[PDB]
């Protein structure tokens, strides 16, 4: 053997794979924030109501740990509708407001009717 460098750098040794022989928490914990806990209730003020028929957007109030990909599947799977885009906002009572715009295939003024308002 020859040592072409004056540096002795330490050898790449073998690193095993952590394959333990008992689980440390025994069960995968469930997702507390699922598609019901995402989206608490819809917002029915005067400014949100005239954003329904004028803009094809319906407004909810969403749990503050939810990003827009989580919202976009949560309105799609609960209400069986396509979502164009989402715009969030933290309104200063502390809860996240989401402006869910629909795809133009759907309508907002009758999807609001089948959810109550």
């Amino acid at each position: 053997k020859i040592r072409t460098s004056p540096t002795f750098r330490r050898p790449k040794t073998l690193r095993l794979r952590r394959q333990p022989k008992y689980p440390r928490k025994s069960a995968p914990r469930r997702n507390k924030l699922d598609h019901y806990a995402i989206i608490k209730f819809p917002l029915t003020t005067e400014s949100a109501m005239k954003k329904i028929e004028d803009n094809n957007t319906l407004v909810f109030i969403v749990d503050v740990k939810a990003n827009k990909h989580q919202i976009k599947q949560a309105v799609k799977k609960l209400y069986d509708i396509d979502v164009a885009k989402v715009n969030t906002l933290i309104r200063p009572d502390g809860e996240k407001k989401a402006y869910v715009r629909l795809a133009p295939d759907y309508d907002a003024l009758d999807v609001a009717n089948k959810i109550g308002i």
Partner: protein, 234 residues
């Protein structure tokens, strides 16, 4: 043949880049390496006392191979054969009740603390002693003691090798107490070859200091001053 050409590289100063040469001297070692190397130097540079310097005078390998040939069939009992040896004692005692089935099972002892008991009782007939005990005071008394109780001793090279006799890692000493009487004539063969070299020489091996040689880069300039003194006279 048509086009191929020699095109060598000038490797003097100011020409083509120097090749990957050896550099295994000029390489920055870890501090466990040069700590491990500088004391091999520093056993050679200090004045080593003769009590430590009993070692470095070990057996030549022809005698040491004859010695391990003799010690090979006196190998101690392993736990594999300890299972069946307590069977063969117990199955025949269950069948005949032997008053003495084996008068003499012979074996070699192991261990500093066991050997020291044998030498100062003069029960041992030859004391193999190791070379590279890391706290050398575990062994340094024992050559001086085998002279006084008159037991022959021999320093062997390597405490790993006689450790494999006893199925262990290091065992630092073994002893010969009862060899077979038919193979006493192999133990008695090399025992005068040994106590020529160790026990009879004790007046001189106790005087022999060790170490105290300068390094080769500093004893070479000693010789170059002496050649200049040799060129001064003639």
């Amino acid at each position: 043949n048509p086009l191929f050409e020699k095109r060598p590289k000038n490797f003097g100063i100011g020409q083509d880049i120097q090749p990957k040469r050896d550099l295994t001297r000029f390489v920055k070692w870890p501090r466990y390496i040069r700590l491990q190397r500088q004391r091999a130097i520093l056993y050679k540079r200090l004045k080593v006392p003769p009590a430590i310097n009993q070692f470095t005078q070990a057996l030549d390998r022809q005698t040491a191979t004859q010695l391990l040939k003799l010690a090979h069939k006196y190998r101690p009992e392993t736990k594999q054969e300890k299972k069946q040896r307590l069977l063969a004692r117990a199955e025949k005692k269950a069948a005949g009740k032997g008053d003495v089935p084996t008068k003499r099972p012979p074996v070699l002892r192991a261990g500093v603390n066991t050997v020291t008991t044998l030498v100062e009782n003069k029960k041992a007939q030859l004391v193999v002693i190791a070379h590279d005990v890391d706290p050398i005071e575990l062994v340094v008394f024992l050559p001086a003691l085998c002279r006084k109780m008159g037991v022959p001793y021999c320093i062997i090279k390597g405490k790993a090798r006689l450790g494999r006799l006893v199925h262990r890692k290091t065992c630092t000493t073994v002893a010969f107490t009862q060899v077979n009487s038919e193979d006493k004539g192999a133990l008695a063969k090399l025992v005068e070859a040994i106590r020529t070299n160790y026990n009879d020489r004790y007046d001189e091996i106790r005087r022999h200091w060790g170490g105290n040689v300068l390094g080769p880069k500093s004893v070479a300039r000693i010789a170059k001053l002496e050649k200049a003194k040799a060129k001064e006279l003639a």
